[PDB]
Write a protein that binds this ligand. Sequence first.
Ligand SMILES: Nc1nc2c(ncn2[C@@H]2O[C@H](COP(=O)(O)OP(=O)(O)NP(=O)(O)O)[C@@H](O)[C@H]2O)c(=O)[nH]1
Ligand SMILES: [Mg+2]
Lengths: 130, 207
Amino acid sequence: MPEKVELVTGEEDEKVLYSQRVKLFRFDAEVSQWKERGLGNLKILKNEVNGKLRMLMRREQVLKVCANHWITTTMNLKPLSGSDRAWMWLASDFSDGDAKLEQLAAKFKTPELAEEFKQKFEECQRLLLD
Amino acid sequence: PQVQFKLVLVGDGGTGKTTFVKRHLTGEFEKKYVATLGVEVHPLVFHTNRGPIKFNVWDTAGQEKFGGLRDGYYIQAQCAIIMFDVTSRVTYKNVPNWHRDLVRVCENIPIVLCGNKVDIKDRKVKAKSIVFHRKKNLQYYDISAKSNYNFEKPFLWLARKLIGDPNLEFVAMPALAPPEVVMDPALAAQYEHDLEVAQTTALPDED
Ligand SMILES: Nc1nc2c(ncn2[C@@H]2O[C@H](COP(=O)(O)OP(=O)(O)NP(=O)(O)O)[C@@H](O)[C@H]2O)c(=O)[nH]1
Ligand SMILES: [Mg+2]
């Protein structure tokens, strides 16, 4: 049988600045529908060696990546008309190991938690201007 | 030198086979019933403490209009999932036929039995009625593609049987650093306009 392998997370050099359970969606423009992308912890990670910031999220049970993209100053968290606890934004995502331009949205448990994320996300964006 | 396994996914039409596969692939939940025509092979990779394993899932058409020689799609199979719907007694009544057809072609392959749609309260196939797995020594699971209840267990169990390690674990997928290429502001603005409808399109979870 295959031998046991080193467990590699890709986060060994990183520090969690934020982690909150959310439901992630991805807009399918072909059919003009939001599609569930996963359920799990959406994290803001800071790489302690080079200082880079990224979004990272894995799906629960299957444990597969559903969000993996650098935070940029260009990203603009926007509300959705149908929710009081969700934001949408555009990102070049690397979940599947290939860069993909994706229209994403995340729904939080409460509006307070969504506001908390937006404040933390935009604090990070401002630090990038420095 | 990838560790692959052919997996045949069978069951009466409407039991949720394709919805189950799509859920695993993209995380989506398709609400529409578009009957599968023919056979569609989908690779599904899981990360284990012994490395990644790939299930080439053969999603089949449950309807008997497509059953003239369905045996041929079971050749070289290494495992299988039989799926039925707990809100439709007929789907469970036909499980023995699905199991019979499989073993006739593939003999001793690991096979998991899945009662899908357990999220619905009006369960027409009761838990005490489900006995066929005891009879044949199969692994059974209540699953829900809609609630994700136990929806990874069939693959975890099959992975342990096929690899021969009852302590196999599914582990976090490695998340490598994205490339330096990101959306330039102009392209980002171009897509904010093209995809503006997304801002006024309801989330499906709002249900
Ligand atoms: N409540 C609920 N509905 C489900 C679940 N899984 C599937 N469905 C619904 O069941 C319907 C049939 O699903 P589908 O995946 O097409 O079934 P199939 O087993 O592939 N059909 P066929 O063999 O003809 O191709 C869909 O309309 C889907 O929304 C589940 O876990 N819960
Ligand atoms: Mg189908």
